[PDB]
Symmetry: C5
């Protein structure tokens, strides 16, 4: 899994039937020390991640193992909203509670 931040959304009305009601978030990947990277993913989200939240994203067939994900032609999903990130025992980031 990669760490990313939620930074937008995609909407579509013409799409595979199996994607009805699927929320598509745009994610910007986060690098060392939380660098905003010039790289992005569009991902399904069944967890309920808000704008600017740090998340874990899973890619490949992992995405189909989200809740009700089985028949969906998705290759990226949000799987967790990040509460904390630590490095070498120091908190680097933490979430509003």
């Amino acid at each position: 899994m990669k760490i990313a931040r939620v930074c937008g959304t995609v909407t579509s009305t013409q799409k595979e039937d199996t994607l009805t009601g699927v929320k598509f978030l745009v994610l910007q990947y986060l690098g060392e020390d939380g660098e905003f990277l010039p790289d992005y993913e569009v991902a399904a989200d069944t967890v309920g991640a808000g704008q600017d939240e740090w998340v874990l994203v899973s890619r490949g067939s992992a995405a189909r193992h989200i809740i009700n994900g089985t028949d969906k032609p998705i290759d990226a999903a949000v799987v967790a909203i990040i509460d904390t990130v630590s490095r070498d025992n120091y908190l680097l980031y933490s979430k509003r509670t």
Copy 2:
């Protein structure tokens, strides 16, 4: 998934027998800002996307989960035609 633009097609008469009737689009992947990359994918299309339309592309086994996709040796598929893309707060794209 990645955001891409439909910019071509591919056709083939000598191919795996399971690929009959599968339509292939050439796609160009979006970079950052709203600028496109010189990086392309050929993808199955069952959604019916046309030139210049923006799409979501899924890669790997996800591609086998398009309509009638079971057991087809494909690793890339258009899964949606995009109407809007927002980023940070503003509207980066609108059909």
Copy 3:
């Protein structure tokens, strides 16, 4: 999938029993609009693609969905020999 040209062959006499009868082609990926890159793949082929032909290559578990691919440890296969590629209006490639 990616577009590549067939450019060679690999052979092996010590290998997994699961690769019995598998022909290996070396493929060179097409890059920068229509120029060939210094990036290669080794791929299975049942369709009969020859030197210099253009092909669609599928990677990952898609490769095991070629005819007789089931349960072989292969992660790349030629799935189609390319007749035509069209970018926007014009062609670009035609066999």
Copy 4:
């Protein structure tokens, strides 16, 4: 598989229900020489790796094949804590 070192942790309380109990480690990938890359992965750990230890990480569907991994939406997992790594007639690392 890739070689990485354990450099931190991630926690989460809003997540997929299938991920209850999953320990998430932050891993830094090994680059050239024994230099590490500014490139990180967050991986499940059933083996019980700690800070500064070297591990093998498997990605993709492999990760679901760790003990109890089945049907968890994870795409990276620690699968071994490394004792040694050699390159040629010598040792790059020993615990």
Copy 5:
């Protein structure tokens, strides 16, 4: 599949139980002409390759389709020892 050269080994005693007896090789990916790249993989080896031998590596779920690979959380395996590699119209490698 990628062409790689065997350039070391990894050992581990604390590891997923399904990886008992698995031999791990460190491999370096081949690049431009004969040049080997500054990128590497660790791969399960059930075929028996030695130092400096050239090998085909299969990655992702292919790796679980080696003999008895089925429940192993591995994403890379040596599937063959290369005897020959031919590219365009010259021999690049011949053991």
